[PDB]
Amino acid sequence: MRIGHGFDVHAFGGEGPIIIGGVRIPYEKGLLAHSDGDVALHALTDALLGAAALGDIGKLFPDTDPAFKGADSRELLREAWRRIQAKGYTLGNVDVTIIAQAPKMLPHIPQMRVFIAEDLGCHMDDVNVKATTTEKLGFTGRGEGIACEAVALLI
Amino acid sequence: MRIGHGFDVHAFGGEGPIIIGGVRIPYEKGLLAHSDGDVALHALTDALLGAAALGDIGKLFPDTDPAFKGADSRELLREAWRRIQAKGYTLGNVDVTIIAQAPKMLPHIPQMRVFIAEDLGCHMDDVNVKATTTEKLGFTGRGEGIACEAVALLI
Amino acid sequence: MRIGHGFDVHAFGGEGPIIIGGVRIPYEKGLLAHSDGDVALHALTDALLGAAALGDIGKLFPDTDPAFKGADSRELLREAWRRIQAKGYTLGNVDVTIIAQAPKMLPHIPQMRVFIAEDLGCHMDDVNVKATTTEKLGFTGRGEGIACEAVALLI
Ligand SMILES: C[C@](O)(CO)[C@H](O)COP(=O)(O)OP(=O)(O)OC[C@H]1O[C@@H](n2ccc(N)nc2=O)[C@H](O)[C@@H]1O
Ligand SMILES: C[C@](O)(CO)[C@H](O)COP(=O)(O)OP(=O)(O)OC[C@H]1O[C@@H](n2ccc(N)nc2=O)[C@H](O)[C@@H]1O
Ligand SMILES: C[C@](O)(CO)[C@H](O)COP(=O)(O)OP(=O)(O)OC[C@H]1O[C@@H](n2ccc(N)nc2=O)[C@H](O)[C@@H]1O
Ligand SMILES: [Zn+2]
Ligand SMILES: [Zn+2]
Ligand SMILES: [Zn+2]
Numbered sequence: 001m002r003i004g005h006g007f008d009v010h011a012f013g014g015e016g017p018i019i020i021g022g023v024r025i026p027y028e029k030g031l032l033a034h035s036d037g038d039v040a041l042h043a044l045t046d047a048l049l050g051a052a053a054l055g056d057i058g059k060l061f062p063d064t065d066p067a068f069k070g071a072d073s074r075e076l077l078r079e080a081w082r083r084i085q086a087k088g089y090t091l092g093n094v095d096v097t098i099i100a101q102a103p104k105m106l107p108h109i110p111q112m113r114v115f116i117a118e119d120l121g122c123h124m125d126d127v128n129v130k131a132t133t134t135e136k137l138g139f140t141g142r143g144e145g146i147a148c149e150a151v152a153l154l155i
Numbered sequence: 156m157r158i159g160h161g162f163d164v165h166a167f168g169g170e171g172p173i174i175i176g177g178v179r180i181p182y183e184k185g186l187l188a189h190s191d192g193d194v195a196l197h198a199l200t201d202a203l204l205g206a207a208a209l210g211d212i213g214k215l216f217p218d219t220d221p222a223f224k225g226a227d228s229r230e231l232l233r234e235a236w237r238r239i240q241a242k243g244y245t246l247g248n249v250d251v252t253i254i255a256q257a258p259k260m261l262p263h264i265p266q267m268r269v270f271i272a273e274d275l276g277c278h279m280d281d282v283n284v285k286a287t288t289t290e291k292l293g294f295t296g297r298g299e300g301i302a303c304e305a306v307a308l309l310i
Numbered sequence: 311m312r313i314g315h316g317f318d319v320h321a322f323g324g325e326g327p328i329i330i331g332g333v334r335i336p337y338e339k340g341l342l343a344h345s346d347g348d349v350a351l352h353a354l355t356d357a358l359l360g361a362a363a364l365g366d367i368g369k370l371f372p373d374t375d376p377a378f379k380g381a382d383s384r385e386l387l388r389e390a391w392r393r394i395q396a397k398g399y400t401l402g403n404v405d406v407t408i409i410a411q412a413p414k415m416l417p418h419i420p421q422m423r424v425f426i427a428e429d430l431g432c433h434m435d436d437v438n439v440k441a442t443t444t445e446k447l448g449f450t451g452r453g454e455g456i457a458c459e460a461v462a463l464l465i
Binding site: 156158247248250251252254261264279280281282283285286287288289290291292293296304305306307308 | 311312313314315316317318319320321342356357359360361363364365366368369448449454455457459461
């Protein structure tokens with residue numbers, strides 16, 4: 001069994017909605033990013049690649065490579081996972097922690113878990129997502145951006 | 156074995172003391188919160204619920220539900236743990252990282268570990284707590300609030 | 311198997327280069343610290359000590375003790391590891407996440423992994439390091455300092 005850790009942040013910018021964990025969440029402002037800026041799935045991906053010792057998302061899919069411009073983060077997630085499985089690993093479980101003052105992630109989590117468990121090919125039971133605010137403190141508390149952390153256990 | 160991750164932050168406000176990890180730590184200012192604002196135990200709780208795939212603290216015990224107003228975070232911890240055990244899990248071990256510029260958590264950690272190991276019904280050996288400052292950087296470095304991270308391994 | 315979590319931050323200050331993960335990385339400004347301010351290895355160390363239930367780096371090697379002034383963080387890492395092994399543990403694997411807007415950690419990671427795997431006496435395969443920016447947000451985004459997180463699994 002191997003453990004992995006990921007972390008990511010994206011700044012708000014433009015018009016909503018935002019895409020977090022695959023779910024299109026309505027919000028006043030949107031997220032600035034090369035990809036779809038899915039903070040939750042980037043953080044999750046790095047955690048998996050991390051536990052597989054494959055580096056990180058920016059190693060496999062370059063921030064600068066133009067093909068990833070607007071790229072569906074679930075696409076990157078599924079590839080990183082394909083590569084991880086090929087290296088001989090199987091999913092233990094993952095846990096995601098979305099750090100955002102707003103929007104309200106709560107109602108979108110079940111669906112977030114459906115997408116992720118799909119992409120990973122596991123039961124939703126091996127996938128957990130939660131959220132927290134930083135009580136108006138920080139760039140997150142000020143609504144400047146969203147951050148997200150994640151851990152994964154591979155077998 | 157399952158892994159979990161939690162994270163929490165609370166802003167300073169009012170008169171001291173603060174309650175972290177169950178310990179009443181004396182400090183100039185106190186912590187603003189619905190509950191007792193025990194950042195360390197909230198972070199710990201989410202990590203456990205996270206590894207159990209039960210969501211998070213705000214799911215089980217609503218921030219808005221008035222009964223949790225002033226609620227002893229060890230109470231929430233023990234319940235979340237009861238529910239976790241019922242789902243068939245047993246504690247592997249937990250590790251907490253308190254991120255605060257001040258107060259000095261160090262002298263209070265042994266006692267923090269006694270409370271937590273009690274609430275979890277394990278040996279202190281399966282419970283670790285540590286602290287760190289952010290070197291005067293950030294909302295924590297500026298003494299605006301305390302943050303805390305935690306991980307847990309369930310069996 | 312035991313899990314551990316570490317976190318650390320150091321403010322920029324003075325002239326470069328910086329030392330991260332053992333690697334001397336060239337940068338305009340340098341890092342302020344008692345030790346060599348190796349954020350990555352401090353974070354890694356706490357994760358290992360954390361999983362071993364030995365506390366944290368500041369417990370074993372006091373910030374105030376003058377001998378650690380300028381201390382090679384790999385030295386502290388190796389000791390904490392010696393002590394950890396003595397307590398009967400063996401390395402499962404570690405994963406580090408350097409949170410910095412700049413400098414570019416990417417090219418230095420292979421070498422970072424060589425040093426760490428050496429100090430831990432494992433194969434590089436049990437050691438992963440990755441990096442991320444906070445998209446110009448926060449003290450990190452503002453180039454005020456570097457932060458780093460890490461997780462470890464002991465056996
Ligand atoms: C999915 C993509 O957006 C591409 O489409 C990227 O792969 C990742 O984008 P991102 O989440 O915005 O992450 P970024 O903060 O821009 O950084 C990605 C890459 O830069 C490197 N990096 C980052 C920060 C830093 N101080 N030094 C670095 O070397 C890391 O190795 C990482 O692989
Ligand atoms: C223990 C309690 O205080 C109740 O007494 C709460 O359960 C938790 O309080 P807290 O530590 O201050 O955490 P909070 O930051 O206020 O958020 C709690 C809940 O809000 C949800 N949440 C939070 C932030 C966000 N952007 N979207 C969300 O949906 C999460 O699902 C979480 O369950
Ligand atoms: C390696 C050394 O620099 C010594 O040479 C230190 O061991 C660690 O230095 P550091 O990474 O800069 O970490 P610091 O943020 O200065 O804090 C170290 C110690 O202070 C304690 N601490 C920290 C913050 C806080 N609010 N309360 C505390 O009690 C912790 O128990 C930790 O062990
Ligand atoms: Zn991203
Ligand atoms: Zn809280
Ligand atoms: Zn340090």
